[PDB]
């Protein structure tokens, strides 16, 4: 007899939209997330085995066009740098670096042309002599994110709307699919920072006991490979360049922030590495991967190109771009301190969208932002030398998608919808 | 957060004097702001305060027609302007937070954590 | 009022337990007098919140006293770094200070 | 939630035991949208389960007593097999197929004959 | 509405009398946001507390047998000393913490324990 | 034994949005509001009691985000007035008064530059000889309010959504704090009509017998003093001095809209205030000051207040801002007709934002405004020397925060959530 249960306990995997959460002007605004539970309770479940594949999760998605979307509503009513996109009389004052450049704005108050200037990095300045130009102003719209609003990073819980559950994976080693047999259903995820980088993973998760290497696919060269460390590196990146602040009016209500003189002399930024906990990161990083290939040789070559953003090591210190040399860091090989120089940069090509940009206005100085070093995003260069010379596997950083920032800290959580109604065989009217 | 007074100033009497104080790190119209001078040998004397949201003042007694406070909402600004200055009037002025907030019942009260460098200004013939 | 009576000044050996007081009348009404400590060249900062409190910050050298007309600040074993003029603030309808103790240290 | 990874018989009290409007809850432009739309999504499907098993003559039951005799195409087993050993996860994957037509008959068997 | 002053048991002699509903209306792009958010709010607790009534072995009836045992840890008062001597409110307060506890163990006996046994007697 | 009982007459403190009902273009009369007012009677609740708070009451706050919102919402399409930040050439058409300024505008056709005048208030113009410029015409966005746009506000009663209901205090002498006795239940509260002023309380409700006065604290001088009369003063306020309005094309399928001339002689704004009514009213604030504060003795003062919105009383009559003198008002001593010439402004600084500017339209000159006086909005000076001539109390006219010109109304109410479903012990199964 076909009786009806009502309850029971199954789930079908299905996609819904979670809400931010936060423990806490800034983004990721109180208004917007809800404060964040105590001790959400985490509910093992017994002889339960779950499939989990960490690049087909939608939770990634999310967090892509969500933090996105946000990114914009911040920006939205920032003031536009439009009135700037003019030829400049522009020279010098690392050699020259920063440049003391000049211009005619005509409006500040909106009918009296003022001769104005302003320090500018060179790589935000276009030749076009003495004559130059701000960089993109002609192909997209350049906005000043608001000084009112912190960008900076904190933990984000995201959480299931009600009908739904998110499943997390327990497993030691756990690798990036498959069955898990440790799965317990949670509430919300443990708190993501949304930090944005490129070659270098920072503040995320550590591995536990060993440095986990996931990849969708090892054979396939054009996947990226992430490494989890299971101990982290602290970095502390430095803009010692001292400077004043300068506010020049360009519109109503509408000003632009700049950076009025350096003081004393020019220091460009660096960042502290320490040498052994470096080397032993590779080494035990090289000792994974001659687990994965063949005792082939494991080396580190640079980078191969591409975008400045991929080619240099990107991040972001307080509102200070930084877009670090790492060459030092990516030429060694394995077959069985540290100091490096860093760029700064205003105008950033935010999510690579065309025909958007945004403006970092500058800070005092004396800046320091002590990082951990939690794991890298890495591709393999494979090559063809298959008859001769076939012995040397080579690894590069690699970077600039977003979702592998997220994906290397949600590839343990799943989620599933709840499906009520089932019916058995039993015995009765 | 900080207050910022503007730099020290020397007047002869029968003068006036504007300072300024800048408000960082906390939104400026949610608290009040007192303003208080210090005259060696007399400890401080409480001056005034403006309520910087609906800019409702209030003075002692030996200011009155004498001391304008004001403020400007776009900068979070408040300016003290202090006319026919006597000697009498050495001394160090600052801002400094008022109470806990606007909106509590001892609100305007009972704090004054943040507080400036202060300003000096100086009277004489 | 201008009743915030503090001995001019005090002092003691470091180690040692110090009290300063102004015990104005007009605390029961407000029930309140508050505590500041101010450095050679520095504005004034709070030692005390509200009456006894101790503001973040704050060393655990610093509490307070209040009983009908008393009004005290104690400093716990007193340190060199404790140097400072210490001043009573009170609302008696109008905010009122104490001339201010100066305290230094043996 | 709760011993999905038990006998169906051992499931017959986590059955009740989650039946609990898991699909409403206490929390506290665009965010407060794409929230709001998932509440009323989550409303209609409470709903859609009230209003079906209503239908099939269903009311406030956990455990519904039906009309219609079990069809052993419907992968019989035994009894002991699926109370005492099938999970619940497990049993649905296999009626999965007769999804449309077990309901069907219910309609038919407990309320409209 | 008015009877919350008085005592438990002279407020339940009018529960069906006071039991107005209230969730038929009348008069059948942020404030739009705003009402929208309030009606489906509204639209949630009612079914929140039909979906409780309903585990719990409740047909709508005002007042539901049970199958849970009252004990001295919630309360030791004697039952002229609640339903005399007390209003609901009072009431409330006193036992608010054993809410969950008791809510949870309605549900284990009144319709948790009681279907199984009703598929029992289906079963012979 | 445990039984469930239903529809338990018990409730516990919630906030929830309140509803918007009317009476029977329009907007704080209520254009988007629904006249849901089928005779909502009260019922008494017998031998209960209830805590109310008039200053923690977040019924005001409501009011507060909820008028702002609609105000940008009805005025968000409205034409922009950049086009008018040009170096004006102005002369004196009391002393200049009106200003007659003459200008440069270049938007409708962007390639040529016409010649516009306009007359209007030298309250709202800066000086930089004949050089002037627009007071808000930097570091604020002006809007010229739509023609087709009103806010005459009327009553308007807000209810609780079903779940809700709104207490009430019928208690007599009941100071805003603390315990009602008398306490009864409405689903609506009564019409509350969004009058928008300062120092004097217009258009709003009378205590039932005598003047009262209510303070958050009376110690604590910060506070302000909110003082509900039982009798209204009505004044007669007009400006009988005829213009007649140009149009201006600004911009693109855009008009603005200013004075073009002046019509007859010159006269200014002026309110009629009964001289016995106004000074018999201050008796009678004054007796119940004393009782207060045990005789001493009072005395109303001027406002100081720096800030024209403050120092003067704003005052709304239709489409014409007026600012008043009342220093003629708040001049006596209690120890036991007037007219008031008034300043016209047309740009607003509505709701004391930034960036929130709005220029009100001409009317035609002639304007007749009737309003009722049922409060005051007042401070406390005293305590400076207290050790000596300190007898004397002063009160001077306090405003600005509207939250005071809501809670003056709102004081009695409060909002709770409904809780049905509770249990009890019985002798039952
Ligand atoms: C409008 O009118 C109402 C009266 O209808 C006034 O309400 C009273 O306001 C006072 C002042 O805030 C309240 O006083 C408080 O009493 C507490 C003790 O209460 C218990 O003990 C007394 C003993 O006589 C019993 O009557 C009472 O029912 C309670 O059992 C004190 O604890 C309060 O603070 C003191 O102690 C704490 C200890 O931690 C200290 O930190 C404080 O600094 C302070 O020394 C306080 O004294 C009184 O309770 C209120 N009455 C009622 C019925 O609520 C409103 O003030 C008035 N409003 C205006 C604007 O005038
Ligand atoms: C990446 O994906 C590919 C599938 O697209 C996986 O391919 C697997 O490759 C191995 C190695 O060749 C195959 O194993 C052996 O192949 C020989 C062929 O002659 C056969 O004789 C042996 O008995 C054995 O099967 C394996 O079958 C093949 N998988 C499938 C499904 O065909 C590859 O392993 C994936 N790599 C990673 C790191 O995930
Ligand atoms: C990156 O920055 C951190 C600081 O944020 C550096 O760590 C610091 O290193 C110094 C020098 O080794 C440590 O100083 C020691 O302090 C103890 C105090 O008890 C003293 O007894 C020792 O004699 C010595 O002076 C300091 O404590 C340590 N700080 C922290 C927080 O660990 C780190 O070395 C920098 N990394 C690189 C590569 O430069
Ligand atoms: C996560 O990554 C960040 C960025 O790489 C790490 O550095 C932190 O950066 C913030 C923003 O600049 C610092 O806060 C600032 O401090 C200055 C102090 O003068 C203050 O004026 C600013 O308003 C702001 O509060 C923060 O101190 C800095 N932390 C450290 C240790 O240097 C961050 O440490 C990484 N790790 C974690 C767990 O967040
Ligand atoms: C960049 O380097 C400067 C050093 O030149 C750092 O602080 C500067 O310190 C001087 C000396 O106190 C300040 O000048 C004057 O000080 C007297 C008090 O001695 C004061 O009465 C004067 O009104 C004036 O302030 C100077 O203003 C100050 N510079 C700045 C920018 O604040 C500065 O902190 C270093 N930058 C960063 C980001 O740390
Ligand atoms: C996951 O699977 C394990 C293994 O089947 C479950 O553990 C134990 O399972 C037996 C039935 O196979 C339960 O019944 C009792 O076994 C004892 C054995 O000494 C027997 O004397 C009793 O008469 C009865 O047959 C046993 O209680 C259970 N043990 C525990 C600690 O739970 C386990 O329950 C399964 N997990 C879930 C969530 O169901
Ligand atoms: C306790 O509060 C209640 C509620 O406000 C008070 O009852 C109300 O009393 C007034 C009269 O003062 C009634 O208004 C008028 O009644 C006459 C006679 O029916 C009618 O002709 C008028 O048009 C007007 O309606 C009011 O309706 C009544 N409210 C209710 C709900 O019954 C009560 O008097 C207060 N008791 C004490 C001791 O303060
Ligand atoms: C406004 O806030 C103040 C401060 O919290 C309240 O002050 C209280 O005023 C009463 C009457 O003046 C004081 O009662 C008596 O004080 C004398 C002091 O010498 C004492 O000997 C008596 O036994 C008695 O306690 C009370 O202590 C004082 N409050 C303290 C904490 O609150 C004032 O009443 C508040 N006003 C309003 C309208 O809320
Ligand atoms: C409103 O408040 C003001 C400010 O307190 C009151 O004005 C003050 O009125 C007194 C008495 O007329 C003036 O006293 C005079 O002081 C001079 C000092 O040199 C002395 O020589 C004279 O013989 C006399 O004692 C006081 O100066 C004046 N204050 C100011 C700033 O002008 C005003 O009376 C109050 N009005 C009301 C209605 O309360
Ligand atoms: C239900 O109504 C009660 C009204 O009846 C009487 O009210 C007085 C207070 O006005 C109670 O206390 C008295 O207070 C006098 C002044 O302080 C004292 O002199 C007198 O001795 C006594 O203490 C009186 O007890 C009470 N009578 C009875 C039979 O209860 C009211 O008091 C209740 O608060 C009210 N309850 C609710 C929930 O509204
Ligand atoms: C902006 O353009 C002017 C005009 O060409 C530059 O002025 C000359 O600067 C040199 C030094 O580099 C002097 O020797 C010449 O005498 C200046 N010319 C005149 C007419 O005075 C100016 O240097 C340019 N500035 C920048 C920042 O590029
Ligand atoms: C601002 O505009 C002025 C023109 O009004 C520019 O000055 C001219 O520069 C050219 C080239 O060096 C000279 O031949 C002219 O004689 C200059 N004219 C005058 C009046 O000086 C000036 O360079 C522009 N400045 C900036 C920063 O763009
Ligand atoms: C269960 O129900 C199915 C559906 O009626 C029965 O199988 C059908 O048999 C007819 C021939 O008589 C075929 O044409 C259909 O295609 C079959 N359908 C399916 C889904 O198999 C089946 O015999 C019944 N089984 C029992 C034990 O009662
Ligand atoms: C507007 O601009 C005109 C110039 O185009 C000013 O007119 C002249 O100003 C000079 C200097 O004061 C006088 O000597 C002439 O007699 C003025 N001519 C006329 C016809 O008035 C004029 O004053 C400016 N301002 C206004 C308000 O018109
Ligand atoms: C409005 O309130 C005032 C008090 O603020 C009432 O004034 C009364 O005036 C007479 C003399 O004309 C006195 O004998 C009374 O004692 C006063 N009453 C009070 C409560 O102070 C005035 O009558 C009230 N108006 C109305 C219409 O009731
Ligand atoms: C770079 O190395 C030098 C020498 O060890 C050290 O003094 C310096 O602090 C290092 N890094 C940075 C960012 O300053
Ligand atoms: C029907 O059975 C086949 C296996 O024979 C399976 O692949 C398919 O998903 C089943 N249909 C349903 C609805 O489960
Ligand atoms: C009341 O019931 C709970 C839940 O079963 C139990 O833990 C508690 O000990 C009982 N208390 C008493 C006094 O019976
Ligand atoms: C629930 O907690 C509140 C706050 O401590 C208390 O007032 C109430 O009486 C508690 N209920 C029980 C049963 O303890
Ligand atoms: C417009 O600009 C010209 C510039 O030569 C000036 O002479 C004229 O007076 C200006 N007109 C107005 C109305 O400002
Ligand atoms: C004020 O004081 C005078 C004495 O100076 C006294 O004659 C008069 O009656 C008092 N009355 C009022 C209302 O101020």
């Known amino acids: 007899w076909v009786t009806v249960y009502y309850g029971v306990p199954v789930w079908k995997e299905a996609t819904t939209t979670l809400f931010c959460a936060s423990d806490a002007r800034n983004v990721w605004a109180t208004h917007c997330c809800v404060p964040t539970d105590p001790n959400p309770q985490e509910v093992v479940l017994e002889n339960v085995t779950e499939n989990f594949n960490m690049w087909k999760n939608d939770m990634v998605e999310q967090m892509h066009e969500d933090i996105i979307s946000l990114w914009d509503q911040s920006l939205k009513p920032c003031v536009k740098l439009t009135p700037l996109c003019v030829t400049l009389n522009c020279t010098d004052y690392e050699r020259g670096e920063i440049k003391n450049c000049s211009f005619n704005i005509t409006t500040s108050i909106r009918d009296k042309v003022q001769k104005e200037y302003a320090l500018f990095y060179k790589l935000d300045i276009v030749p076009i002599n003495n004559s130059y130009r701000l960089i993109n102003c002609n192909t997209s719209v350049i906005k000043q994110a608001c000084p009112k609003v912190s960008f900076e990073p904190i933990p984000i819980h995201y959480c299931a709307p009600a009908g739904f559950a998110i499943l997390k994976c327990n497993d030691k080693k756990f690798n990036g699919t498959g069955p898990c047999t440790n799965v317990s259903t949670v509430q919300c995820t443990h708190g993501i920072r949304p930090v944005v980088s490129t070659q270098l993973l920072l503040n995320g998760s550590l591995a536990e006991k060993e440095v986990v290497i996931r990849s969708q696919n090892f054979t396939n060269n054009a996947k990226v490979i992430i490494v989890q460390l299971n101990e982290s590196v602290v970095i502390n990146c430095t803009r010692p360049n001292n400077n004043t602040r300068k506010s020049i009016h360009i519109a109503p209500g509408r000003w632009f922030y700049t950076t009025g003189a350096i003081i004393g002399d020019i220091r460009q930024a660096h960042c502290n590495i320490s040498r052994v906990k470096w080397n032993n990161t590779l080494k035990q990083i090289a000792t994974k991967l001659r687990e994965q290939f063949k005792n082939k040789t494991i080396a580190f070559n640079q980078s191969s190109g591409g975008d400045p953003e991929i080619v240099m090591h990107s991040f972001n210190c307080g509102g200070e771009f930084f877009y670090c040399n790492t060459t030092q860091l990516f030429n060694s090989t394995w077959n069985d301190h540290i100091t490096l120089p860093c760029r700064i940069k205003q105008i950033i090509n935010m999510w690579q969208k065309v025909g958007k940009a945004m403006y970092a206005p500058p800070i005092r100085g004396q800046i320091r932002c002590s990082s951990n070093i939690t794991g890298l995003l890495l591709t393999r260069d494979g090559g063809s030398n298959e008859n001769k010379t076939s012995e040397t596997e080579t690894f590069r950083p690699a970077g600039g998608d977003m979702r592998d920032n997220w994906r290397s800290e949600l590839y343990k959580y799943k989620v599933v919808k709840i499906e009520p109604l089932g019916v058995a065989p039993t015995k009765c009217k | 957060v900080q207050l910022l007074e503007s730099g020290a100033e020397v007047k002869k009497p029968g003068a006036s004097v504007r300072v300024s104080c800048e408000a960082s790190?906390?939104?400026?119209?949610?608290?009040?702001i007192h303003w208080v001078r210090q005259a060696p040998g007399h400890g401080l004397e409480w001056i005034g305060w403006?309520?910087?949201?609906?800019?409702?003042?209030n003075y002692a007694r030996n200011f009155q027609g004498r001391l304008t406070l004001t403020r400007d909402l776009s900068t979070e600004t408040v300016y003290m302007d202090l006319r026919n200055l006597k000697s009498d009037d050495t001394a160090v002025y600052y801002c400094?937070?008022?109470?806990?907030?606007?909106?509590?019942?001892?609100?305007?009260?009972?704090?004054?954590?943040?507080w400036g460098q202060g300003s000096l200004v100086t009277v004489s013939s | 009022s201008y009743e915030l009576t503090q001995p001019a000044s005090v002092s003691g050996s470091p180690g040692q337990s110090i009290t300063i007081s102004c015990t104005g009348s007009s605390i029961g009404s407000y029930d309140l007098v508050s505590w500041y400590q101010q450095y050679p060249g520095k504005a004034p900062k709070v030692i005390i919140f509200?009456?006894?409190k101790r503001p973040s910050g704050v060393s655990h050298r610093f509490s307070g006293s209040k009983s009908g007309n008393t009004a005290a600040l104690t400093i716990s074993g007193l340190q060199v770094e404790d140097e400072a003029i210490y001043h009573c603030?009170?609302?008696?309808?109008?905010?009122?200070f104490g001339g201010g103790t100066r305290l230094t240290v043996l | 939630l709760g011993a999905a990874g038990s006998t169906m018989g051992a499931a017959s009290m986590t059955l009740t035991v989650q039946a609990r409007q898991l699909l409403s809850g206490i929390v506290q432009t665009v965010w407060g949208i794409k929230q709001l739309q998932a509440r009323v999504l989550a409303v209609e499907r409470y709903l859609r389960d009230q209003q079906l098993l209503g239908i099939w003559g269903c009311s406030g039951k956990l455990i519904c007593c039906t009309a219609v005799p079990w069809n052993n195409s419907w992968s019989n087993r035994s009894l002991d097999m699926i109370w005492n050993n099938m999970t619940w996860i497990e049993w649905e994957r296999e009626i999965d197929n007769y999804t449309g037509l077990i309901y069907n008959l219910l309609e038919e068997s407990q309320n409209q004959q | 509405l008015g009877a919350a002053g008085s005592t438990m048991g002279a407020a339940s002699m009018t529960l069906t009398v006071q039991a107005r509903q209230l969730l038929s209306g009348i008069v059948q792009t942020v404030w739009g946001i705003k009402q929208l958010q309030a009606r489906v709010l509204a639209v949630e607790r009612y079914l929140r507390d039909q979906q409780l009534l309903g585990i719990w072995g409740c047909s709508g009836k005002l007042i539901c047998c049970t199958a849970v045992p009252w004990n001295n840890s919630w309360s030791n008062r004697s039952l002229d000393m609640i339903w005399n001597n007390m209003t609901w409110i009072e009431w409330e307060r006193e036992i608010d913490n054993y809410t969950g506890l008791i809510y949870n163990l309605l549900e284990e006996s009144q319709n948790q324990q009681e279907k199984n046994e009703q598929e029992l007697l289906e079963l012979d | 034994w445990v039984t469930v009982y239903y529809g338990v007459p018990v409730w516990k403190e919630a906030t929830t949005t309140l509803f918007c009902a009317s009476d029977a273009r329009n907007v704080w009369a209520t254009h988007c509001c629904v006249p849901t007012d089928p005779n909502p009677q009260e019922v008494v609740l017998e031998n209960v009691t209830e805590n109310f708070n008039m200053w923690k009451n977040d019924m005001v706050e409501q009011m507060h985000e909820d008028i702002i919102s609609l105000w940008d919402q009805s005025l968000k399409p409205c034409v922009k007035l950049t086009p008018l930040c040009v170096t004006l050439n102005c002369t004196d058409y009391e002393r200049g008064e009106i200003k007659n300024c003459s200008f440069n505008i270049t938007t409708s056709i962007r390639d040529k530059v016409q010649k516009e005048y306009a007359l209007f208030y030298k309250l709202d113009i800066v000086p930089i000889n004949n050089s002037y410029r627009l007071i808000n015409c930097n570091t604020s966005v002006i809007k010229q309010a739509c023609p087709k746009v009103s806010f005459e506000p009327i009553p308007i009663h807000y209810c609780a959504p079903a779940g809700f209901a709104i207490l009430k205090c019928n208690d007599k002498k009941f100071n805003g704090t603390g315990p009602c006795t008398n306490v009864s239940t409405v689903q609506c509260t009564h019409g509350i009509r969004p009058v928008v002023s300062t120092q004097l309380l217009l258009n709003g409700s009378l205590a039932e017998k005598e003047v009262v006065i209510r303070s958050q604290n009376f110690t604590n001088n910060a506070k302000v003093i909110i003082v509900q009369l039982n009798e209204s003063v009505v004044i007669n306020c007009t400006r009988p001095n005829n213009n007649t309005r140009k149009s201006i094309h600004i911009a693109p399928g855009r008009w603005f809209y200013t004075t073009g001339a002046i019509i007859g002689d010159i006269r200014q704004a002026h309110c009629n205030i009964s001289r016995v009514k106004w000074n018999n009213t201050l008796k009678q604030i004054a007796t119940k000051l004393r009782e207060q504060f045990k005789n001493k003795t009072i005395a109303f003062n001027q406002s100081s207040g720096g800030d024209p919105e403050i120092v003067m009383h704003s005052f709304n009559c239709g489409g014409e801002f007026f600012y008043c003198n009342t220093t003629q008002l708040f001049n006596s001593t209690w120890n036991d007709h007037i007219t008031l010439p008034c300043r016209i402004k047309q740009i607003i600084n509505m709701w004391q934002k930034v960036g929130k500017a709005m220029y009100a339209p001409p009317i035609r000159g002639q304007i007749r405004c009737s309003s009722n006086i049922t409060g005051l909005l007042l401070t406390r000076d005293g305590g400076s020397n207290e050790n000596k001539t300190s007898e004397t109390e002063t009160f001077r006219p306090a405003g600005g925060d509207m939250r005071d010109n809501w809670r003056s109304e709102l004081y009695k109410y409060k909002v709770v959530k409904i809780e049905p479903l509770g249990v009890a012990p019985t002798k039952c199964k």
């Open positions: 603030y009170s609302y008696d309808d109008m905010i009122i």
């Open positions: 509200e009456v006894s």
């Open positions: 790190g906390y939104t400026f119209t949610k608290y009040f």
């Open positions: 400094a937070r008022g109470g806990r907030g606007y909106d509590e019942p001892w609100g305007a009260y009972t704090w004054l954590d943040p």
């Open positions: 403006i309520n910087t949201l609906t800019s409702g003042v």
